[PDB]
C-alpha cells in the first residue's frame, strides 16, 4: 500500500480486547476455513444452543513461559487450556456439548541482535505418547489435561518404571512430535514460524475440527498447540539468554448444547 498498510502490521479485535502487532508474518487460516456456527443441515442436538458471543469470544492471555538455550518445547490442548478462562470456561462446564474455533496469537519479541526460530503448530487430534513401556494408552485424564499451564517436550524418552504406582503421564520426545512421527514433517499441519530476525508473533485462526458436528468439550480436545525451537535461542555472547513467550487465545463462534448442573471434574 502507497497509503501505508502492510503485512507486518495488524490489529485484531474481538469483544473488549484488541491486539496490535508491528512485526507479523501475515496470518494463517487453518485449511483455509474460517470458524463458523453450526449449520441446520449439519446440526444434531435438537435444543436451542447457548451462544455466549462477546462474553466468551474474546482474548484470554495464559501464563507467560520462558524460552532458554535448554528449552525443548511446549504444548497445550484446546479447549483444555481455556477451561478456567472467565465466562468461556463456565459455559463449557455447564453444558454437555460444545464447539469452538480459536484465534491463537503467540507472542515472542527479542532484539536485532538475538537469533532463534520457534515452530508453532496447530495439530488436529494431537494424541501424545505415554511414559510406559509395560502398558499402553494409559496416561490419566489429570495428566493429559494440564489446563492453561500446558506441558513440555523432552529430548529423551525415559520410561516410567514404578510399576506399583505408575506416573501415568505423557512422555513426548521433541523430534518425534511426541507422537511417533518426525518433527520435520509437522509442517503439513497449519503453522507459522517465529524467526526472531523476521517476526515477533504467530497468528493462527483455527476452525472447529472433528468427525462430529459437536462433542463433549470436557472429554475431548480438538486441537493441540505445539511450540518447538526449530533453531535455538542465541544472543550476543551470553551463555544463558532468556526471552518470554506469551500465548493469547480467543474462542470464536462458540456454541453449547445440553444444559444442566455444572461439571466439577477431578483435575488433581
Amino acid at each position: 500500500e502507497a497509503c501505508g498498510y502492510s503485512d507486518r502490521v495488524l490489529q485484531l479485535t474481538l469483544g473488549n480486547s484488541t491486539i496490535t502487532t508491528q512485526e507479523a508474518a501475515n496470518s494463517v487460516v487453518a485449511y483455509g476455513r474460517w470458524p463458523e456456527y453450526l449449520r441446520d443441515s449439519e446440526a444434531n442436538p435438537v435444543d436451542q444452543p447457548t451462544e455466549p458471543d462477546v462474553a466468551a469470544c474474546r482474548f484470554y492471555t495464559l501464563d507467560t513461559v520462558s524460552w532458554t538455550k535448554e528449552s525443548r518445547g511446549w504444548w497445550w490442548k484446546l479447549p483444555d487450556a481455556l477451561r478456567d478462562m472467565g465466562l468461556f470456561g463456565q459455559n463449557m462446564y455447564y453444558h454437555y456439548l460444545g464447539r469452538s474455533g480459536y484465534t491463537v496469537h503467540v507472542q515472542c519479541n527479542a532484539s536485532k541482535f538475538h537469533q532463534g526460530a520457534l515452530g508453532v503448530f496447530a495439530v488436529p487430534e494431537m494424541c501424545l505418547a505415554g511414559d510406559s513401556n509395560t502398558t499402553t494408552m494409559h496416561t490419566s485424564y489429570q495428566n493429559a489435561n494440564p489446563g492453561e499451564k500446558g506441558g513440555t517436550f523432552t529430548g529423551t524418552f525415559t520410561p516410567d518404571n514404578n510399576q506399583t504406582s505408575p506416573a501415568r503421564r505423557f512422555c513426548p520426545v521433541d523430534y518425534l512430535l511426541g507422537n511417533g512421527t518426525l518433527l520435520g514433517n509437522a509442517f503439513v499441519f497449519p503453522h507459522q514460524i517465529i524467526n526472531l530476525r523476521t517476526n515477533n508473533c504467530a497468528t493462527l485462526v483455527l476452525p472447529y475440527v472433528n468427525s462430529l458436528s459437536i462433542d463433549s468439550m470436557v472429554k475431548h480436545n480438538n486441537w493441540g498447540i505445539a511450540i518447538l525451537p526449530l533453531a535455538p535461542l542465541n544472543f550476543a555472547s551470553e551463555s544463558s539468554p532468556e526471552i518470554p513467550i506469551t500465548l493469547t487465545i480467543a474462542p470464536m463462534c462458540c456454541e453449547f448444547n445440553g444444559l444442566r448442573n455444572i461439571t466439577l471434574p477431578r483435575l488433581q
Binding site: 444434531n44 435438537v46 456439548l97 445440553g258 448442573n261
Partner: protein
C-alpha cells in the same frame, strides 16, 4: 458358451443376501389376502406406542406386579428423589424390557427423542406438584431437586388431566448411540421429585401409586440389525 470369469464371493452363502431362486411349487394357486385389521409396516411404529416401565426392580418387588408401581405419599416436602433412571433405553434394566427396549435389542444403534408419561393413580381428593427432570450427561447425576432443576424439566401439576408427559430431546455428541452401556454414548439422567408435596384431606388414603410409560417420538430411528440377548436356547 459365453466366456465368463468367476469372481470372489462365488458359491458362498451370505445369510443377508438377496437373490432369486427356483420355485419348488410352480403354478400353485395362492390364497389371496383379506383386509385384516392392525397391519404394521415398520418396527418403529411399535416403539411409538406407550408401554409401562418396571421402575421398581428392587429384590422383593421385581418379576411381580409391584415393579410397575411407584409409591408416593402425603409426607412433608423433601428434595430427595422419588426415582432415578439412566437414559440407556436398551441396556438399563428398567427400560430394557419395555416394548421400546425390546425392539432396540434387535439393533446396534439408536437415535431420536423419547417421551416419558406419568399417570397419577391416587384419589380425586389428592393434590400435588411434582418435578420431572432430564439431565444430559457429563456432570454429577442429580441427587437433589436443586441439581435436577438446572436441566431439562417439567413441573407437573396434579389435577383433572390425569397424566403428564416429559419429552427427552435428542441431545447427543454422536449421530447414533449404542444399544449397550457405554460411556462414550451415555445419554444422561432421568429423575423425579416432589415440587411441593402430595396433600390429602381426612378420610382419604395417604399413599398412592404413579405409573410411568415410555415411547418414541417421530424423529426416532434404529440401525444395524442384530440378534438379541433377551432370548436363548441353552441346549
Amino acid at each position: 458358451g459365453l466366456p465368463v470369469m468367476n469372481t470372489p464371493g462365488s458359491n458362498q452363502y451370505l445369510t443377508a443376501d438377496n437373490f432369486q431362486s427356483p420355485c419348488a411349487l410352480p403354478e400353485f394357486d395362492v390364497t389371496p389376502p383379506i383386509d385384516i385389521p392392525g397391519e404394521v409396516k415398520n418396527m418403529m411404529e411399535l416403539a411409538e406406542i406407550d408401554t409401562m416401565i418396571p421402575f421398581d426392580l428392587s429384590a422383593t418387588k421385581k418379576n411381580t406386579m409391584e415393579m410397575y408401581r411407584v409409591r408416593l405419599s402425603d409426607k412433608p416436602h423433601t428434595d430427595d428423589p422419588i426415582l432415578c433412571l439412566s437414559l440407556s433405553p436398551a441396556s438399563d434394566p428398567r427400560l430394557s424390557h419395555t416394548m421400546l427396549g425390546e425392539i432396540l435389542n434387535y439393533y446396534t444403534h439408536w437415535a431420536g427423542s423419547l417421551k416419558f408419561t406419568f399417570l397419577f393413580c391416587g384419589s380425586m381428593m389428592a393434590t400435588g406438584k411434582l418435578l420431572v427432570s432430564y439431565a444430559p450427561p457429563g456432570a454429577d447425576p442429580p441427587k437433589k431437586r436443586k441439581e435436577a432443576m438446572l436441566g431439562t424439566h417439567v413441573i407437573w401439576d396434579i389435577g383433572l388431566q390425569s397424566s403428564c408427559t416429559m419429552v427427552v430431546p435428542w441431545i447427543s455428541n454422536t449421530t447414533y448411540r449404542q444399544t449397550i452401556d457405554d460411556s462414550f454414548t451415555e445419554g444422561g439422567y432421568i429423575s423425579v421429585f416432589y415440587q411441593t408435596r402430595i396433600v390429602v384431606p381426612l378420610s382419604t388414603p395417604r399413599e398412592m401409586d404413579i405409573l410411568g410409560f415410555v415411547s418414541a417420538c417421530n424423529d426416532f430411528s434404529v440401525r444395524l440389525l442384530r440378534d438379541t440377548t433377551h432370548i436363548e436356547q441353552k441346549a
